[model samples]
Target chain A: RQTETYITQINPEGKEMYFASGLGNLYTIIGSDGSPVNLLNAEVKILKTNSKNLTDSMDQNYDSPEFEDVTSQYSYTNDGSKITIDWKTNSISSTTSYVVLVKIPKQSGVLYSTVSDINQTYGSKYSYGHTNISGDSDANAEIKLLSLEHHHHHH
Target chain B: QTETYITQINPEGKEMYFASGLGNLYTIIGSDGSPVNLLNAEVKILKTNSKNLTNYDSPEFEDVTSQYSYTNDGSKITIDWKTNSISSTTSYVVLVKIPKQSGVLYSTVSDINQTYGSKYSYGHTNISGDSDANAEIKLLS
Candidate 1:
C-alpha cells in the first residue's frame, strides 16, 4: 500500500471524486533549531479564477527541501539543479533546468518573483521574499546557493 | 472504466494535481494605495482534463491543447480561455493581495526605503498612498 501517497477514491457515473493536491515546495526551510519546515506536505484547495479580476478569482508555489545532496528522487539537486532562500537577505535562487520551472512565495508580495535560469546552476538575489524570520538588524546579510558552479553578479 | 492508472517509480516527491489560476499572483500593482485598490482580473484559465479533475491545476498545462487571452479593462484585467473538459471540472485559484503599505507595513517600509543602500523598490512618489509600493512577485513559469 502507498501509505505515503495521500489519496481519496471517488465514484463517477453522474458522480464525482473530490480530488485534491497538496501545497509547499521542492525545497525545505531549516529553522534555527536545525529542524526542517515541511510546509509542502500539507493539503491544498483548488480553484478557478480570472487574471484581470484577481480580487474576484485565484492561484499559488513553495520552497525546496535541504539535504546533504538530498538523496531523494524528487529532490531539486538530484541532477545538479539547485534552490536556496535567505532569511536575512530575503532572496531566492531556483532553477529552470527541469521539465517545469517552479515559483515560490518569498516576502513582500502575494505570488512570486525572480524567474529561474534555464540551466541556472548558480544565481543570487536581494531581499527576495517574505518569511517568519525576526528582525535583529541589517548587518552583513548574505546568502549562497552552492551548486556545480557559483557565479556572483550584481544587476 | 479503468481508473486512469498513473504511477511513478522510486519517487521521492509526490504532488496531487488540481486546477490552477493564471500566472501566479506575483504581487498587487496599481497607481493608487487606498488599501481599497486591489488586483482584479477576469481570467479564462482553462484546461482539458478528466471531468471532475477534482480541484485546480496550473496556469500552463502539461499539454498545450488549451488557450487563454486577456485584456486590460482599466481597473481590471479581463482574462478568458477555452476549455475542452467536456467531462471533468476545471478549477482555479486567483490572487489578489494588499501590499504592505496602507495595511500595517507602511511606516516601517517608509523608513527602510529612505535608508542608505536599501533593497526594497517602491512605487513612484506621484502614485499617492502605497504609491510607494507594488507587489514585487510574478508567475514562476
Candidate 2:
C-alpha cells in the first residue's frame, strides 16, 4: 500500500494563524489513500521557522533547534479514516510569522514532508470562539454545572 | 494515585455562581503515579449542540476558543471571555487535554468558580463532578 500525508489547521475558523499561549490550533492529518495513520507510532516531526523558507528547510534537511520531534503536548482523535492533532499553542512566540512543516514517512520507506502555507500570530488577542466537548473521564457522572462564557471584542 | 481539590473561595464574601456548562480540572495522574498539572498542556473549550451532550466519543466537537484570548498563569490557562454571556438555552463543554507523563489524556471539570486547593481543604473532592445544586441548594443558602 502507498500513502501520503497532508496537514491542515481545521480550527479557529477564518484566521489560520498560530494561536499563542493557550490551546487553539487543531492540525488534522489526511492520507492520500484515505486511511488513518497512527501518528504516535509513526515518524513525525513538526519543523517551525520564523523567516527561513519552509520548503528549503525541509529539502535541505534542517537540523537542531528548528525541528521538534512530536511531543505529548499534542492530542488527537483517530476515527479510522482521519486524525486530528490539537496543540495548546503554549510557549510559542507571539506577534510573529511562522511556517510549519509536517514530516512523516511514506509507506514506500521514503520520508515525506509537507509545508503549511505562511501563518501569522498576534497572540491571544485574536482568539476564536469555544466549542462543545464531551468528557472523557467521567462522562456519565451526574450532570455538572458547566459555565459557558462568550465575549465579543469590538476591536 | 495523585489528587487535586477544586473549591470556591468567595472573594470579600461575594458569591460566585456558575450556570450549567463545562469547566477545567487542572491536574491529572501521570503514568508515574505523580500528579501533573496542565501547565504545559493544551486546554481547550469545544462547542457542539446539546444533542451530542452525552456523546463522549463524538468527533462533532470543534475548537471554539481559537479566536478568544487565553492566559497561562504558570498553573492553569484561562480562556478569557469574549462576551459577558451566552444563550441561556444552549449548552457548552470545556475540554482539558493534558500531555501525560507518556502519551496524552483528556478530561473535564464542573467546578467553574472553584480553584485547585490543597487536598485537606474543606469541601474538597479529588473528583469534582458536582452539579450546581451543591452551590445553589446548599452553599448559596
Candidate 3:
C-alpha cells in the first residue's frame, strides 16, 4: 500500500536544468495535505504524496530512473565468438549502482552489460552484451551514456 | 551502419607517452528519427590507477605529409612516425593504438604486445568477471 518507484531523479545540471526553474520544478499537483518542495540548488530531491497516497506504484506512467550525462571510456576484446564490452567512465552521476545496456556488435535479442557498476564519480562496468545502446563509433556508444536517465536505484 | 574512430594521449606517463583509440559501427535512425552522425556523439576514457589525459582532434588528411601515419589489418595495427626523428621535439615520446575488430574474445588482449607494446602491469586481461584488465584507463577535458 505504501511504495514509491524511484522515478528519474530530477537534475538541474544539464539539459534538465531549465525544467528545474520556476514552474518547471512542479510535478504532480498536490492535494490539500502537501506539495513537492525544492530549494532550487539542492543536490538531491524526491516526490511523494502526503496522505492517502493512492498511486499503487511509484512508477505511475513513467519508466525507471536513469543516469543523465554518463561519461566513460569503453571497449571490448573478443575471443572466438564471445564479445565482452570493457567500459569505464568518470562522468556518470553517483547512484545506487548501474546496469549495462548495449546494442551488441553483430546481432541482438541476447546482449549483456553487467553488474555495470560505477567507478568513482568515474566508474567502469564490464557488460558481456543488450538493448540499451545505439551508436556507430566508440564515441557514439559513449554518447548514449550521456543521455542515460537511470540512476541505479532499482537495486 | 558505418565505422569511425577517436584517439587519446599519454596518461600516467611516469616514463613513456602512450596513445590509443578504437572504432565501432553505428546506424543512423535517419528518416525514422532525426538524421545524425555517430561522429557527433561524446565518449571518454576513465582511469582507476592514476590521472589520465586526452585532446580534441584538429585533424590532418591521409596520404599526405604528416607527423603520424597509420594502417591496420584487424588484429595487427601499425603506425609510422613521419616526423623528423629530431630530438628537438623529443622528450614527448608518442604512442598510438587501434582497437580490436571485435570484443574481448580470449583470456588476453589480442593486441597486447609484451615485447613492443610495453604493458606496465602485465597479465590481467581476458579474465571473466574482472574489470582489472581495463582498469586505470582515463580521459581528459
Candidate 4:
C-alpha cells in the first residue's frame, strides 16, 4: 500500500474532525520480466453516518446503519502520482456519535470504469480496512478507526 | 451614580445578554433599578490582534450580535457564537478575544438551550469586571 489517510481532532474540546489522505510516496513496480508499471490517477472517497447512530449493533465499521455521501465536502491536491484529500469538519455535534468510512480504489491493473462510480454498481465486492480506533464508552472525543480499505473490486 | 448603564454592571449583575440572526438583547437595570430592555444595541465581538474595549474611545470593531443565536430565561442569556456558520461545510480557525467590558461571550458549545452551570469556561473571566478572556477555536473536518 502506497497511500495513507489521517483522521485528527483539531481542538481539545471541539466537535470537529480533520481528515487527510494520499500522504504516501508513489513508486513504479518492476515486473518479473523487467517491465515497469506506474500507478497513476489515485482516487479517494470518504463517507459519514447520515445521523447520530453511535450505539448501532454493527460489528465492523462498514456494517453500520447507513452513510451519506460526504465526498464533495473536501478539498484535493494532486502531486503527479497521488491525489490528496483534506476535509475540516465545522458543524459536527459532540454529543452525537459518528462513524466515518474511507475507500481508495486500486489504481494498478484497475478493472473499474471510474472510481466515483465504483460504489454505485459494484459496491459489495470491496472489503474492510483499518486504522486507530478508541474505546466505545469514552469515545466522544476520539474515533474508532479510519480504515483506508483497498477496494478489491471484482474482475 | 444617578443612572446605571449596561456596561457599568458585571455580566452576572446585569439581567441577560443574548444575540441571534434576528437581533440582540440586553436586559439591564435603569436608574430606578428597573428592567430596561435594549434591543439590538451597538455590541461587537473581539477575537484577534489584541483588540480591547476599554471605553467609548476604543478602536473600531464589528457589531457581530446578529451573527449568533441565543436563548434567555428572563434574566440570564446564553449566546451561541459559533466559529463559523452552523451550515458551513468546511472548517475554520478563529481567535475570539472578548473584552471584559464588552460583555460579549463566545462559549465552548454553540447551543443556547443547554445549561451553563458546568461549562468548561462559560462564565470564568468574562463575568468579572477586571480582566478579559481569549479563546482560539480551530474546527477541522
Error of 2 at A133 (Å): 24
| Residues A79-155 of candidate 1: C-alpha lDDT, one tens digit per residue | 11223321111122221111112322222221111111222111211111222122323321111000000011111
Docking verdict class for candidate 3: incorrect
User: Candidate 2 or 4, higher DockQ?
Assistant: 2
Q: Give Cα distance to truth, residue A150, candidate 3, Å.
A: 20
Ordered from best to worst TM-score, the candidate numbers read 2, 3, 4, 1
Q: What is the CA-based DockQ of model 1?
A: 0.02
Candidate 1 per-residue lDDT, tens place, B43-85, comes to: 2233333232212245343332234334443343322223211
Task: Rank candidates, lDDT, best first.
Answer: 2, 4, 3, 1
Tens digits of per-residue lDDT for model 2, B56-117:
23687555657553565534445433432333333444444443232112122213333321
> lDDT tens string, model 4, B1-141?
011121211111111222244232221111111232223223333221222211222343334445643444433344433421221111111222222222212222222333211111111112211111111111112
Top candidate (TM-score): 2
What is every candidate's alpha-carbon RMSD to the true fold?
A: 21.1, 19.7, 20.7, 24.0
True interface contacts reproduced, per candidate: 0.01, 0.01, 0.01, 0.00
Q: Write the per-residue lDDT of candidate 3 for residues A12-126, one digit (tens) a residue.
A: 1121111111221111110011122211221212221211211212223222233322313333333423333322332223222222222112221111222222221111222
Displacement of the residue B102 alpha carbon in candidate 3, Å:
4.8
